[PDB]
Write an enzyme that holds these catalytic residues in place. Structure first.
Site, PDB file in Angstrom:
ATOM      1  N   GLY A  93       0.815  -1.193   0.000  1.00 33.26           N
ATOM      2  CA  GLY A  93       0.000   0.000   0.000  1.00 33.26           C
ATOM      3  C   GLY A  93       0.860   1.258   0.000  1.00 33.26           C
ATOM      4  O   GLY A  93       2.087   1.213  -0.019  1.00 33.26           O
TER       5      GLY A  93
ATOM      6  N   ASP B 201      -6.937   4.648 -14.066  1.00 25.24           N
ATOM      7  CA  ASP B 201      -5.936   3.590 -14.179  1.00 25.24           C
ATOM      8  C   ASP B 201      -6.585   2.276 -14.577  1.00 25.24           C
ATOM      9  O   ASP B 201      -6.200   1.199 -14.105  1.00 25.24           O
ATOM     10  CB  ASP B 201      -5.124   3.448 -12.890  1.00 25.24           C
TER      11      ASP B 201
ATOM     12  N   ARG C 173      -4.730  -5.219 -15.089  1.00 21.30           N
ATOM     13  CA  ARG C 173      -4.010  -5.446 -13.804  1.00 21.30           C
ATOM     14  C   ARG C 173      -4.853  -4.944 -12.624  1.00 21.30           C
ATOM     15  O   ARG C 173      -4.756  -5.568 -11.549  1.00 21.30           O
ATOM     16  CB  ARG C 173      -2.641  -4.761 -13.831  1.00 21.30           C
ATOM     17  N   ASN C 174      -5.879  -4.151 -12.911  1.00 24.17           N
ATOM     18  CA  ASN C 174      -6.747  -3.603 -11.873  1.00 24.17           C
ATOM     19  C   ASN C 174      -8.131  -4.226 -11.880  1.00 24.17           C
ATOM     20  O   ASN C 174      -9.066  -3.652 -11.309  1.00 24.17           O
ATOM     21  CB  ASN C 174      -6.871  -2.082 -12.009  1.00 24.17           C
TER      22      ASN C 174
ATOM     23  N   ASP D 253      -8.928  -0.936  -7.995  1.00 25.30           N
ATOM     24  CA  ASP D 253      -7.797  -0.031  -8.223  1.00 25.30           C
ATOM     25  C   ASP D 253      -6.764  -0.285  -7.136  1.00 25.30           C
ATOM     26  O   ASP D 253      -6.982   0.080  -5.977  1.00 25.30           O
ATOM     27  CB  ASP D 253      -8.240   1.425  -8.232  1.00 25.30           C
TER      28      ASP D 253
HETATM   29  C1  LIG Z   1      -7.800  -4.307   0.006  1.00 25.17           C
HETATM   30  C2  LIG Z   1      -8.234  -3.517  -1.074  1.00 25.17           C
HETATM   31  C3  LIG Z   1      -8.346  -2.145  -0.931  1.00 25.17           C
HETATM   32  C4  LIG Z   1      -8.784  -1.344  -1.988  1.00 25.17           C
HETATM   33  C5  LIG Z   1      -9.105  -1.905  -3.211  1.00 25.17           C
HETATM   34  C6  LIG Z   1      -9.589  -1.154  -4.302  1.00 25.17           C
HETATM   35  O1  LIG Z   1      -9.825  -1.711  -5.341  1.00 25.17           O
HETATM   36  N1  LIG Z   1      -9.897   0.129  -4.076  1.00 25.17           N
HETATM   37  C7  LIG Z   1     -10.501   0.915  -4.989  1.00 25.17           C
HETATM   38  C8  LIG Z   1     -10.272   2.282  -4.936  1.00 25.17           C
HETATM   39  C9  LIG Z   1     -10.887   3.159  -5.821  1.00 25.17           C
HETATM   40  C10 LIG Z   1     -11.755   2.671  -6.774  1.00 25.17           C
HETATM   41  C11 LIG Z   1     -11.999   1.323  -6.844  1.00 25.17           C
HETATM   42 CL1  LIG Z   1     -13.085   0.741  -8.091  1.00 25.17          CL
HETATM   43  C12 LIG Z   1     -11.391   0.459  -5.945  1.00 25.17           C
HETATM   44  C13 LIG Z   1      -9.004  -3.275  -3.342  1.00 25.17           C
HETATM   45  C14 LIG Z   1      -8.559  -4.076  -2.298  1.00 25.17           C
HETATM   46  N2  LIG Z   1      -8.470  -5.376  -2.441  1.00 25.17           N
HETATM   47  C15 LIG Z   1      -7.412  -6.005  -3.024  1.00 25.17           C
HETATM   48  N3  LIG Z   1      -7.649  -7.252  -3.352  1.00 25.17           N
HETATM   49  C16 LIG Z   1      -6.688  -7.968  -3.912  1.00 25.17           C
HETATM   50  C17 LIG Z   1      -6.961  -9.248  -4.232  1.00 25.17           C
HETATM   51  C18 LIG Z   1      -5.899 -10.013  -4.665  1.00 25.17           C
HETATM   52  C19 LIG Z   1      -6.134 -11.316  -5.000  1.00 25.17           C
HETATM   53  C20 LIG Z   1      -7.399 -11.805  -4.865  1.00 25.17           C
HETATM   54  N4  LIG Z   1      -8.436 -11.025  -4.420  1.00 25.17           N
HETATM   55  C21 LIG Z   1      -8.216  -9.736  -4.094  1.00 25.17           C
HETATM   56  N5  LIG Z   1      -5.503  -7.455  -4.160  1.00 25.17           N
HETATM   57  C22 LIG Z   1      -5.228  -6.195  -3.825  1.00 25.17           C
HETATM   58  C23 LIG Z   1      -6.198  -5.464  -3.262  1.00 25.17           C
HETATM   59  C24 LIG Z   1      -5.562  -4.298  -3.097  1.00 25.17           C
HETATM   60  N6  LIG Z   1      -4.307  -4.441  -3.570  1.00 25.17           N
HETATM   61  N7  LIG Z   1      -4.139  -5.428  -3.951  1.00 25.17           N
HETATM   62  C25 LIG Z   1      -2.801  -5.837  -4.539  1.00 25.17           C
END
Ligand SMILES: Cc1ccc(C(=O)Nc2cccc(Cl)c2)cc1Nc1nc(-c2cccnc2)nc2c1cnn2C
Length: 268
Positions: A18, A130, A134-135, A148
Site C-alpha cells: 500500500g 488507471d 491489472r486492476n 484499483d
Molecule cells: C484491500 C483492497 C483495498 C482497496 C481496493 C480497491 O480496489 N480500491 C478501490 C479504490 C478506488 C476505486 C476502486 Cl473501483 C477500488 C481493493 C482491495 N483489495 C485487493 N484485493 C486484492 C486481491 C488479490 C487477489 C485476490 N483477491 C483480491 N488485491 C489487492 C487489493 C488491493 N491491492 N491489492 C494488490
C-alpha cells in the site's frame, strides 16, 4: 462505513504494498477470505485523508462488477480497508496463465461485465484513471470486478497524457486497451515499443492491430474507443448496450476480423 472490530480479522499472507502499509490476504469473522490494506504507524495527515476517503468512496459502490468493501477499521491501529477476496486474482495474470482456454463468448462476457462496472462508476461521477487488466479481479464464476490497486502511458488517452484531462472518456480509451488485453490473453499493448514510441505512433494515427481470432464487431468497438477526439468516443452506456446485444445474438461474434500475419510460412 461498516466498522469491523480487529478481533474479527486475521492477516495471513502479504500480497502487495500500500501507499503507507501492506496488503494482505486474510480471513474475516462476523469465516470469509478477504483482502486487507493497512495504514501503519507514522502515516501523515494527507495519507489518512486519502486512506479513509478511499474507504468512503468504496463503501458507496454497490455493483456486481465493482470490488465489494467488507468494512473498515478506523477506531484502532493499524487502520484497515477490507474487501472480498477474489480467488482467481488479477485479470492480466489470469489470462496469461490460461492462454487459449476460453471461448470467444466467455471473453466477450468478461468485457460486458467490466463495461457495466465502468458505466456505473462513470454514472457515479468517479473517474478511474488507471483502468487496465491489472486492476480487474476475477472470481470463481468468471465475473470481473473493477478495482484499483494503485500504480500507465500505454493505457492512457492522449488528452490525459498531454494536458492531464482525465474523464470517463479517457476511461473509455483505457477500456479499449483492456478489450485488446482480454482478446489477446494478456499481450503487452504495443509490444516492445517504448513509451515515447507509443505516443508518437498514436499521434501519427496508428492503432493496435486486431488480435487473432477476434470478432469483427469487437475490433470495431475497440477502434472507436481509440478516437483521438474525445467527444467521438462511445460512452460506457453505448459500450454496454453493444456488448449485451452481441452476447444475446452470439452468431454476431462468428464473423472475425482479418488478422495481419507477421510471419509467412510457405508449404505445399
Ligand atoms: C484491500 C483492497 C483495498 C482497496 C481496493 C480497491 O480496489 N480500491 C478501490 C479504490 C478506488 C476505486 C476502486 Cl473501483 C477500488 C481493493 C482491495 N483489495 C485487493 N484485493 C486484492 C486481491 C488479490 C487477489 C485476490 N483477491 C483480491 N488485491 C489487492 C487489493 C488491493 N491491492 N491489492 C494488490
Amino acid at each position: 462505513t461498516t466498522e469491523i472490530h480487529p478481533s474479527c480479522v486475521t492477516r495471513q499472507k502479504v500480497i502487495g504494498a500500500g501507499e503507507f502499509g501492506e496488503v494482505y490476504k486474510g480471513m474475516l469473522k462476523t469465516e470469509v477470505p478477504v483482502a486487507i490494506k493497512t495504514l501503519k504507524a507514522g502515516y501523515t495527515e494527507k495519507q489518512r485523508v486519502d486512506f479513509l476517503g478511499e474507504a468512503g468512496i468504496m463503501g458507496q459502490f454497490s455493483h456486481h462488477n465493482i470490488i465489494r468493501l467488507e468494512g473498515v477499521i478506523s477506531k484502532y491501529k493499524p487502520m484497515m480497508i477490507i474487501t472480498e477476496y477474489m480467488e482467481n486474482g488479477a485479470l492480466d495474470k489470469f489470462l496469461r496463465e490460461k492462454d487459449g482456454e476460453f471461448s470467444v463468448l466467455q471473453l466477450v462476457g468478461m468485457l460486458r461485465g467490466i463495461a457495466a462496472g465502468m458505466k456505473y462508476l462513470a454514472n457515479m461521477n468517479y473517474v478511474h484513471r488507471d483502468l487496465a487488466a491489472r486492476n480487474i479481479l476475477v472470481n470463481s464464476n468468471l465475473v470481473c470486478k473493477v478495482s484499483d490497486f494503485g500504480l500507465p502511458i500505454r493505457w492512457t488517452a492522449p488528452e490525459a497524457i498531454s494536458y492531464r484531462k482525465f474523464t470517463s472518456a479517457s476511461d473509455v480509451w483505457s477500456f479499449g486497451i483492456v478489450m485488446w488485453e482480454v482478446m489477446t490473453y494478456g499481450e503487452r499493448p504495443y509490444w516492445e515499443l517504448s513509451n515515447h514510441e507509443v505516443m508518437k505512433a498514436i499521434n501519427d494515427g496508428f492503432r493496435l492491430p486486431t488480435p487473432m481470432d477476434c470478432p469483427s464487431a469487437i475490433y470495431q468497438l475497440m477502434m472507436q474507443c481509440w478516437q483521438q477526439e474525445r467527444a467521438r468516443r462511445p460512452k460506457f452506456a453505448d459500450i454496454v448496450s453493444i456488448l449485451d446485444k452481441l452476447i444475446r445474438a452470439p452468431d454476431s461474434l462468428k464473423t472475425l476480423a482479418d488478422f495481419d500475419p507477421r510471419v509467412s510460412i510457405r508449404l505445399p
